[model samples]
Target: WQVAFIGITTGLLSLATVTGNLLVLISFKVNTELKTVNNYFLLSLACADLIIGTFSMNLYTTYLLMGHWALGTLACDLWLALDYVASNASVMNLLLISFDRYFSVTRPLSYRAKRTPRRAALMIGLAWLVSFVLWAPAILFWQYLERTVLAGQCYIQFLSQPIITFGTAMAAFYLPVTVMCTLYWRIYRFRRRGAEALERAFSLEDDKEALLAALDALAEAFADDAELTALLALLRRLLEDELAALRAALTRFPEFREALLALLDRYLATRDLADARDLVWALVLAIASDPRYRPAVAAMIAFGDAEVLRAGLLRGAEALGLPGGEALVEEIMAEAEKEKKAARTLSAILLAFILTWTPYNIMVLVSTFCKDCVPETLWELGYWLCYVNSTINPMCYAL
Candidate 1:
């Protein structure tokens, strides 16, 4: 019953995963609008999942049912190698996708211009190459360790088995996870700080303009309303406090001044509000580009004040008599919305990786500590986890 249940669940998960990934691929192929660098990486992820679903899932099920290596020694080694290779590839792919999103959000303009379709393809190819290289060692050195009771069991037994396994785990799993976590922290911080700085700068300028315009209007029309006067006063006071806080935060990071100045130049040259907003966003993102800078950037953003730039822009549009202003605002809002959605989806992929694979990793670690405590069933389950990891990513698009 347990074997049957495992087999059925594995098959269902494989189908779900494959189906999900194929739909994502189809969407990218059929919809010209979906052809993006991020989407390209996603397609690569799906392709990896599809390969594992078709090949690895069935092999895993077969191994589980037979309670030993049913295939010949060569088939066992090949399939096991492929399993590890595919697993490594999937994790690495997720790491790369996270960085891709970090770049897209941080440097939206440069990302669009520099991260072309060809470049995306090249990167995807490189990921595959790295994945292949990681698995090659396992295949070359693998042998069956025949025990008295458990004959024909496959394992990697080098002269220094422990050292090799530890080293490989560090290189393949821990290293990538560390880099990704650090990058995310930095990206979040940079975004928060950058938003605060822009808010301060814009509020100061906006309030001054608003006040001068209001006084001029009052002088010309001799009109006065208590509500308007109170609102204006509240706005001015709010801007004053924000400006003070922003200035203090900006002083700690001198590099931010240079970034802000460069961004301002770009904003002025473009005279496009969307471009200006993206520039501010990019300045924050630059901090996350280097792994070293992430901690500092994250700290700054975390402590910084929150400002609703989008809300401010909407209010400004209503106040100003600019032609086609509504359409421009909508466009900027839509772009920001798309970016948020992309970030959320990418985050979901990362979560899926953890949920699907972490159990296998935990079991491996636990088995190392308690030798006889680990069940064969658990080991079998871990084998299927690799297949599960490969299958679910493609299906994420539908969700």
Candidate 2:
């Protein structure tokens, strides 16, 4: 029962891996957009392992059951040599895949440009070549232990030479395991965040440059407020790498921040503020990260922002030595003094207009209602004053 179960599990896994790797290889071949250096290395890893399952394992099993090399002398040697090739290729390609993910995560912008299909293909070829170099001696010098030598068609053995054994261990498992573990551990730090999309954005240099150029051409007066805010919101949602590039664009051009603020101020009254929260947060974080933008973001958070910005204000000011929003209420207050002064001035102007016009209005009302009280000739003077006041009021309003 135990032997049958083991054979069943092992065969299921072997066939699964074989078919799966073939499917992966075919998908890469079919999809043009998937032909990235990162993906190319991955596909080659699948190819090497696919070869192991398809050729070495199946053919080796048949040879062993035959209790001989099974295919004649040279075929046996070639089969044995290919066994070495497939195994080394698997481990080496895995090592390179680790480095691919590591460099892609760590040095995203620059490495994106560097990660090329040609480079990946070269590394993949080297994996097969390295395997050939290590174990081809087993074929040429005939160092492989077969039953012809020790026990014909037996369990896999370590190479006979201690130096070759050490080399094999290093190439096959130890170093690769160590490096792969370290890289994978580092990956766990960033695993929760969404930067896979960011890496793709980093690769699109020309698109980013074109976006910046197009943004530069936009005039504050001509730009639609709704369109501008929507553009920023969409950009914020695109990718971390895309946002990082936008941050750099904002920093590089002194006028972009000014243009953004002006665009904001024009829509302040008509603000579809819900649509701009992400946009505002993106700008705030982008500017806050840079020392050059300290004063600009400070003012933005202090007064010219949503209520959430006040919380953001406290955080940035405490952590970053930016302004603490102490002036906002006070800002509009001595500011408040000028406001009260204007109120008094408006009351005085209203008082003069009221006192002068009230008498004339009263006379008209009395003259109309008082057939027994006042003459039309009396309110006739009041009526002329009303038209004269109307002319004076238009001039006053102009002032």
Best by lDDT: 1
CA lDDT for candidate 2: 0.44
Model 1, position 331, has a per-residue lDDT of 56
* Top of the candidates by TM-score: 1
TM-score of each: 0.65, 0.44
lDDT for each of the candidates? 0.55, 0.44
Q: Write the per-residue lDDT of candidate 1 for residues 1-399, one digit (tens) a residue.
A: 866876787677777866776777788878897676767777777777766676667666766676566434445555656666666777888888877756644543345456788898888889988888766574545343332212334433342454555566566666676777777776665555444544553564433444333323222211132332343343234323244443343334454344544454555456543433343334334322323333222323332223455544454444332355577555555545555566567667767666665666666556556646677767666656646666656545655
Badly placed stretches (over 4 Å) of model 2 are 1-17, 63-74, 136-158, 161-167, 190-250, 253-399
* Model 2 poorest ten-residue lDDT run: 213-222
Each prediction's total of clashing residue pairs, residues at least 3 apart in sequence or on different chains, is 3, 3
- Error (Å) of candidate 2 at residue 135 is 3.5
Candidate 1, residue 381: CA error in Å? 3.8
With a 3 Å backbone cut-off (N, CA, C), the pairs that clash in candidate 2 are 147-151, 147-152, 333-336
Task: Output the TM-score of candidate 2.
Answer: 0.44
